[PDB]
């Protein structure tokens, strides 16, 4: 779960 | 505690 939520938060930072 | 601390940064970065 922590991966999952940490790819996410990885592709949002990689969006700004 | 990592996940806890993961998810409340995953919360603010999506709060930006």
Do not use: I
């Amino acid at each position: 779960t922590l991966l999952r939520m940490v790819g996410g938060f990885k592709d949002q930072e990689k969006r700004m």
